[PDB]
Design an enzyme around this catalytic site. Structure first.
Site, PDB file in Angstrom:
ATOM      1  N   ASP A  92      -2.215   8.457   1.677  1.00 11.51           N
ATOM      2  CA  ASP A  92      -2.072   8.638   0.236  1.00 11.51           C
ATOM      3  C   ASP A  92      -2.275  10.116  -0.086  1.00 11.51           C
ATOM      4  O   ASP A  92      -2.726  10.899   0.746  1.00 11.51           O
ATOM      5  CB  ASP A  92      -3.030   7.743  -0.564  1.00 11.51           C
ATOM      6  CG  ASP A  92      -4.489   7.971  -0.228  1.00 11.51           C
ATOM      7  OD1 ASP A  92      -4.865   9.068   0.224  1.00 11.51           O
ATOM      8  OD2 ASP A  92      -5.285   7.035  -0.444  1.00 11.51           O
ATOM      9  N   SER A  93      -1.875  10.519  -1.279  1.00 13.72           N
ATOM     10  CA  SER A  93      -1.825  11.947  -1.581  1.00 13.72           C
ATOM     11  C   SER A  93      -3.162  12.521  -2.032  1.00 13.72           C
ATOM     12  O   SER A  93      -3.365  13.733  -2.011  1.00 13.72           O
ATOM     13  CB  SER A  93      -0.772  12.206  -2.653  1.00 13.72           C
ATOM     14  OG  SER A  93      -1.224  11.724  -3.906  1.00 13.72           O
ATOM     15  N   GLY A  94      -4.066  11.638  -2.437  1.00 10.21           N
ATOM     16  CA  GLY A  94      -5.342  12.046  -2.992  1.00 10.21           C
ATOM     17  C   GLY A  94      -5.294  12.091  -4.509  1.00 10.21           C
ATOM     18  O   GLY A  94      -6.332  12.224  -5.157  1.00 10.21           O
ATOM     19  N   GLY A  95      -4.092  11.957  -5.070  1.00  8.44           N
ATOM     20  CA  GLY A  95      -3.877  12.092  -6.503  1.00  8.44           C
ATOM     21  C   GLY A  95      -4.641  11.098  -7.360  1.00  8.44           C
ATOM     22  O   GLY A  95      -5.081  11.423  -8.468  1.00  8.44           O
ATOM     23  N   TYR A  96      -4.795   9.880  -6.848  1.00 12.14           N
ATOM     24  CA  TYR A  96      -5.528   8.835  -7.558  1.00 12.14           C
ATOM     25  C   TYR A  96      -7.033   8.964  -7.355  1.00 12.14           C
ATOM     26  O   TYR A  96      -7.804   8.946  -8.315  1.00 12.14           O
ATOM     27  CB  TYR A  96      -5.052   7.455  -7.100  1.00 12.14           C
ATOM     28  CG  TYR A  96      -5.810   6.291  -7.700  1.00 12.14           C
ATOM     29  CD1 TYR A  96      -5.416   5.731  -8.906  1.00 12.14           C
ATOM     30  CD2 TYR A  96      -6.910   5.741  -7.051  1.00 12.14           C
ATOM     31  CE1 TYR A  96      -6.102   4.663  -9.456  1.00 12.14           C
ATOM     32  CE2 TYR A  96      -7.603   4.678  -7.594  1.00 12.14           C
ATOM     33  CZ  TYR A  96      -7.194   4.144  -8.795  1.00 12.14           C
ATOM     34  OH  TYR A  96      -7.879   3.083  -9.339  1.00 12.14           O
ATOM     35  N   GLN A 185       6.233   6.904 -11.827  1.00 11.77           N
ATOM     36  CA  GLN A 185       5.206   6.662 -12.832  1.00 11.77           C
ATOM     37  C   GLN A 185       5.907   6.262 -14.129  1.00 11.77           C
ATOM     38  O   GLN A 185       7.075   5.869 -14.107  1.00 11.77           O
ATOM     39  CB  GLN A 185       4.309   7.898 -13.005  1.00 11.77           C
ATOM     40  CG  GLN A 185       3.469   8.227 -11.752  1.00 11.77           C
ATOM     41  CD  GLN A 185       2.363   7.208 -11.485  1.00 11.77           C
ATOM     42  OE1 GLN A 185       2.070   6.367 -12.326  1.00 11.77           O
ATOM     43  NE2 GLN A 185       1.750   7.283 -10.306  1.00 11.77           N
ATOM     44  N   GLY A 212       1.001   3.564 -10.528  1.00 11.32           N
ATOM     45  CA  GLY A 212       0.479   3.315 -11.854  1.00 11.32           C
ATOM     46  C   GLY A 212       0.321   1.856 -12.216  1.00 11.32           C
ATOM     47  O   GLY A 212       0.071   1.556 -13.374  1.00 11.32           O
ATOM     48  N   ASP A 262      -0.308  -1.983   0.204  1.00 11.47           N
ATOM     49  CA  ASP A 262      -1.633  -1.703   0.758  1.00 11.47           C
ATOM     50  C   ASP A 262      -2.667  -2.225  -0.220  1.00 11.47           C
ATOM     51  O   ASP A 262      -2.460  -2.169  -1.432  1.00 11.47           O
ATOM     52  CB  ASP A 262      -1.851  -0.206   0.977  1.00 11.47           C
ATOM     53  CG  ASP A 262      -2.153   0.526  -0.316  1.00 11.47           C
ATOM     54  OD1 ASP A 262      -1.198   0.924  -1.018  1.00 11.47           O
ATOM     55  OD2 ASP A 262      -3.348   0.685  -0.641  1.00 11.47           O
ATOM     56  N   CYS A 300      -4.474 -20.962  10.672  1.00  6.96           N
ATOM     57  CA  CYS A 300      -4.503 -19.561  11.064  1.00  6.96           C
ATOM     58  C   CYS A 300      -4.524 -19.391  12.577  1.00  6.96           C
ATOM     59  O   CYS A 300      -5.252 -20.090  13.283  1.00  6.96           O
ATOM     60  CB  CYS A 300      -5.717 -18.866  10.450  1.00  6.96           C
ATOM     61  SG  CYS A 300      -5.847 -17.141  10.870  1.00  6.96           S
ATOM     62  N   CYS A 302      -5.384 -16.569  14.130  1.00  6.73           N
ATOM     63  CA  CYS A 302      -6.148 -15.389  14.526  1.00  6.73           C
ATOM     64  C   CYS A 302      -7.250 -15.730  15.532  1.00  6.73           C
ATOM     65  O   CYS A 302      -7.625 -16.890  15.699  1.00  6.73           O
ATOM     66  CB  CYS A 302      -6.736 -14.684  13.296  1.00  6.73           C
ATOM     67  SG  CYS A 302      -8.391 -15.197  12.742  1.00  6.73           S
ATOM     68  N   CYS A 305     -10.347 -17.662  14.170  1.00 13.59           N
ATOM     69  CA  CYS A 305     -10.157 -19.086  13.916  1.00 13.59           C
ATOM     70  C   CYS A 305      -9.945 -19.879  15.201  1.00 13.59           C
ATOM     71  O   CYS A 305     -10.075 -21.102  15.202  1.00 13.59           O
ATOM     72  CB  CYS A 305      -8.992 -19.280  12.941  1.00 13.59           C
ATOM     73  SG  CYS A 305      -9.387 -18.677  11.290  1.00 13.59           S
ATOM     74  N   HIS A 331     -10.165 -11.916  10.366  1.00  9.10           N
ATOM     75  CA  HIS A 331      -9.434 -13.054   9.852  1.00  9.10           C
ATOM     76  C   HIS A 331      -8.605 -12.689   8.616  1.00  9.10           C
ATOM     77  O   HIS A 331      -7.438 -13.082   8.509  1.00  9.10           O
ATOM     78  CB  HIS A 331     -10.352 -14.216   9.496  1.00  9.10           C
ATOM     79  CG  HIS A 331      -9.669 -15.223   8.635  1.00  9.10           C
ATOM     80  ND1 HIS A 331      -8.763 -16.133   9.140  1.00  9.10           N
ATOM     81  CD2 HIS A 331      -9.658 -15.378   7.292  1.00  9.10           C
ATOM     82  CE1 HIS A 331      -8.252 -16.831   8.140  1.00  9.10           C
ATOM     83  NE2 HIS A 331      -8.783 -16.397   7.010  1.00  9.10           N
TER      84      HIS A 331
HETATM   85  N1  LIG Z   1      -1.665   8.028  -5.479  1.00  9.45           N
HETATM   86  C1  LIG Z   1      -1.717   6.891  -6.218  1.00  9.45           C
HETATM   87  N2  LIG Z   1      -2.527   5.877  -5.849  1.00  9.45           N
HETATM   88  C2  LIG Z   1      -2.575   4.746  -6.584  1.00  9.45           C
HETATM   89  C3  LIG Z   1      -3.481   3.650  -6.168  1.00  9.45           C
HETATM   90  C4  LIG Z   1      -4.152   2.889  -7.121  1.00  9.45           C
HETATM   91  C5  LIG Z   1      -5.008   1.870  -6.717  1.00  9.45           C
HETATM   92  C6  LIG Z   1      -5.193   1.616  -5.365  1.00  9.45           C
HETATM   93  C7  LIG Z   1      -4.523   2.383  -4.421  1.00  9.45           C
HETATM   94  C8  LIG Z   1      -3.670   3.404  -4.819  1.00  9.45           C
HETATM   95  N3  LIG Z   1      -1.818   4.623  -7.693  1.00  9.45           N
HETATM   96  C9  LIG Z   1      -1.004   5.635  -8.053  1.00  9.45           C
HETATM   97  O1  LIG Z   1      -0.298   5.527  -9.069  1.00  9.45           O
HETATM   98  N4  LIG Z   1      -0.954   6.769  -7.321  1.00  9.45           N
HETATM   99 ZN   LIG Z   2      -8.139 -16.774  11.058  1.00 13.62          ZN
END
Ligand SMILES: Nc1nc(-c2ccccc2)nc(=O)[nH]1
Ligand SMILES: [Zn+2]
Ligand SMILES: Nc1nc(-c2ccccc2)nc(=O)[nH]1
Ligand SMILES: [Zn+2]
Lengths: 365, 365
Positions: A92-96, A185, A212, A262, A300, A302, A305, A331
């Protein structure tokens, strides 16, 4: 091996399934990325992460730039070597996190305490980490926001997106071996999402994130925005929904054209005693599991389990034992990967609609 | 498979090496037993414990009788099934922990808060757990103690030892499948140790523990007492030093005729950032390891040292990451097992004296 090659093998409605081929491996889509905040997927060895079926993990630029530091990780041979994960990593960019975890915002970037982040510095940090998929440095607009504030924020993010593109392209080794994703965004506003999509497409990225929307707007609103937002993005590139989500969030987002996810939920809630099952989440600490010899989930596949009971894991988590966190996390990540596998197979087989209905019926029951 | 068969393959001075054959597996001696307090060797799956070379682990009767409970574990199929370790388990009697962790002491046993423990109840609890090596219920005399108080305590322990023997023998399934160890007491006093040894030998046990020496008396004093205490025990049965210890404690105790060990040090100190190496312990959090790409120990054969650097593990432990505890613990237990292996091989090969000298020279340097 290709730097970045996205192939769509099959579609059903807005849903797609396919592959992203990269130098460090193939990513099967729709994909779920376990989150590896401080250069670890919490409580799991990388081989265990891989054993669950994960093709790619996420690393956090904000955390790693502070601890142990980007230049340090580069000196130690890059993030892959450092943590012992040799497959793709998206950073991730670090922006959040720069806003949620630390601030002074300006056109240049963000200055903060507990440093400065800019599109150029973000890209350089991700270069130093040796990221495979690099995220443009953006601004996650707070929710809710006025149309005008959402607009000014999105417009800044788009200028930052161009600056990220340029910084990435300037670094030949990065441009040759990694991929760059832009982030859409525009809050919950259709016209701004369109303006954002157009700006990103004009610049050109390997993939497009819907940013966003991990902001507590609720699933209904999230879906509403995805309904019009994802079709705005280039069809022929991956669509990445950041920070989402619960299993039903994922199924609905795939129904709306999302290819990548993610979320900290499986790892974090795992350590907290929540296990995901096809019959919904369970709180393993609950008294009803104290003598339950069944596995966490009886379908499951895994390793947890196959070997241990609910009763045992119940005991571990109540006792604050590290093995409890280990087993719950393995799990949960395995469950998420099995969900993605079922999603991929059902789309490929043209029965995803039925799968989604069947899933929701049982999960919510 | 034999219930319990101890064979001495080789000797050097007072040191012995050999095997204990039991129904659930063979125990190579001298043996180190990882401690699995609450039905887990902390931060390790059982397969990982086994991968380090451990033949047997220790379970704690006091902890397990409270949580999850002995009858509950029996209902769930026994401790082996419960925690997924199918090899031998030695269970302590609860006699020490009932005093250090909780009391009212009497000839019948000990009543306590946060229940009652007696020789008969201890044996029954260990039966319910499905223990392979059962410890007689004893009293760990405080240190220091007057000769007379040490004597009255040891004498009570010997009466309790006879009661443990009788309770064990009364349970046909236990007598057929498990082994019973007696515990020598007598503090630091030679005449009392002799009286204790004679009492235990008169009763007859499968093995004999030297109790009462994990009490902070210092290594010199511990060795002094072992010097005369271990030869008092039957030569033809295993000698078990409870709660010991550091690597040099172990080497010296083997030089004095000890065959079995347990200690929380490798697990507990591992989680706390202390790693054992052939050049002595290191504190992995120390700044000097921040960019150290070497493994924890550059001769160690464990999976951690094959894959990850000091720098990475340094980062994990400083970040409070569960994987840090996992890797430190696996390495430390592996180090302990490699130590025992080197001890066994050197005794077998008749070069243990040289090994002990070489070990001490390098470990203390
Ligand atoms: N860089 C960025 N990260 C996230 C973000 C928000 C919540 C959990 C993970 C990522 N949202 C965004 O709009 N930008
Ligand atoms: Zn499992
Ligand atoms: N049952 C018993 N346990 C211990 C003991 C002491 C310290 C660590 C582990 C065990 N010492 C004894 O004399 N008896
Ligand atoms: Zn090692």
């Amino acid at each position: 091996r290709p730097r970045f090659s996205f192939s769509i093998a099959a579609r059903e409605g807005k849903a797609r399934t396919g592959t992203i081929e990269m130098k460090r491996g193939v990513i099967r889509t729709p994909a779920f990325m376990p989150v590896g905040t401080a250069a670890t997927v919490k409580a799991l060895k990388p081989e265990t992460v891989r054993a669950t079926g994960a093709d790619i993990i996420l690393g956090n630029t904000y955390h790693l730039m502070l601890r142990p530091g980007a230049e340090r990780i580069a000196k130690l041979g890059g993030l892959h070597s450092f943590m012992g994960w040799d497959r793709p990593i998206l950073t991730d960019s670090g922006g959040y996190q720069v806003m949620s975890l630390s601030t002074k915002q300006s056109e240049e970037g963000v200055t903060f305490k507990s440093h400065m982040l800019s599109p150029e510095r973000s890209i350089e940090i991700q270069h130093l980490l040796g990221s495979d998929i690099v995220m443009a440095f953006d601004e996650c607009t707070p929710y809710p926001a006025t149309p005008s504030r959402a607009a000014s924020s999105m417009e800044r993010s788009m200028r930052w997106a161009k600056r990220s593109r340029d910084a990435f392209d300037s670094r030949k080794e990065q441009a040759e071996n990694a991929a760059l994703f832009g982030i859409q965004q525009g809050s919950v506003f259709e016209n701004l999402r369109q303006q954002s999509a157009d700006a990103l497409a004009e610049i050109g990225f390997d993939g497009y994130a819907v940013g966003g929307l991990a902001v507590g707007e609720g699933q209904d609103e999230m879906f509403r925005v995805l309904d019009f937002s994802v079709p705005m993005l280039p069809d022929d590139k991956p669509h990445y929904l950041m920070g989402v989500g619960k299993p039903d969030d994922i199924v609905g987002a795939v129904e709306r054209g999302i290819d990548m996810f993610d979320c900290v939920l499986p790892t974090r809630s795992g350590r907290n005693g929540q296990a995901f099952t096809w019959d919904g989440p369970i709180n393993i600490r609950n008294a009803r599991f104290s003598e339950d010899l069944k596995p966490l989930d009886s379908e499951c596949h895994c390793a947890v389990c196959q070997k241990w009971s609910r009763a045992y894991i119940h005991h571990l988590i109540r006792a604050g034992e590290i093995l409890g966190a280990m087993l719950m996390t393995e799990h949960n990540i395995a469950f998420y990967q099995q969900l993605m596998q079922k999603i991929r197979d059902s789309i490929s087989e043209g029965r995803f609609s039925q799968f989604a209905q069947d899933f929701r019926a049982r999960y919510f029951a």
